[PDB]
């Protein structure tokens with residue numbers, strides 16, 4: 600599913616991401632935009648052989664199981680395919696874990712490089728939430 604910007608903001612809010620660990624909803628929408636372009640089916644292989652899945656590009660080295668990442672952990676206790684669903688619950692639940700892990704949203708390198716420090720509220724401007 601490819602979400603619209605406001606549609607995704609609303610779904611993230613419905614699943615408790617708005618201001619989770621102090622990150623306003625715009626931060627999450629911005630991260631999603633640059634990670635997956637709001638496509639829940641996004642996959643991208645990493646040089647290390649792990650793969651990133653879903654709207655927030657969650658990595659199989661630590662967070663989910665894909666059966667092909669040697670030496671990895673599955674800390675969200677979910678198959679990586681569950682991160683590709685049109686329902687974002689699994690991605691959201693796993694992202695809450697990730698953002699709680701010590702470095703905040705800097706876990707997502709694209710957030711650090713493209714969202715951090717910017718006017719993230721633009722990502723939710725105009726949306727009925």
Ligand SMILES: [Cl-]
Nearest residue numbers: 603604632637
């Ligand atoms: Cl957009």
Ligand SMILES: [Cl-]
Nearest residue numbers: 666667668669
């Ligand atoms: Cl294995």
Ligand SMILES: [Cl-]
Nearest residue numbers: 620702703704
């Ligand atoms: Cl933080």
Ligand SMILES: [Cs+]
Nearest residue numbers: 615617618619
């Ligand atoms: Cs919240």
Ligand SMILES: [Cs+]
Nearest residue numbers: 616617618619
């Ligand atoms: Cs809030």
Ligand SMILES: [Cs+]
Nearest residue numbers: 634642643644
């Ligand atoms: Cs790519």
Ligand SMILES: [Cs+]
Nearest residue numbers: 643644645646
């Ligand atoms: Cs790649």
Ligand SMILES: [Cs+]
Nearest residue numbers: 643644645651
């Ligand atoms: Cs990647």
Ligand SMILES: [Cs+]
Nearest residue numbers: 643644645651
């Ligand atoms: Cs990556």
Ligand SMILES: [Cs+]
Nearest residue numbers: 634643651656
């Ligand atoms: Cs990525």
Ligand SMILES: [Cs+]
Nearest residue numbers: 651656657658
């Ligand atoms: Cs990632």
Ligand SMILES: [Cs+]
Nearest residue numbers: 664665666667
């Ligand atoms: Cs495994």
Ligand SMILES: [Cs+]
Nearest residue numbers: 668670671672
């Ligand atoms: Cs494993």
Ligand SMILES: [Cs+]
Nearest residue numbers: 672673674676
């Ligand atoms: Cs586990």
Ligand SMILES: [Cs+]
Nearest residue numbers: 675676677692
């Ligand atoms: Cs789970």
Ligand SMILES: [Cs+]
Nearest residue numbers: 699700701702
């Ligand atoms: Cs940690």
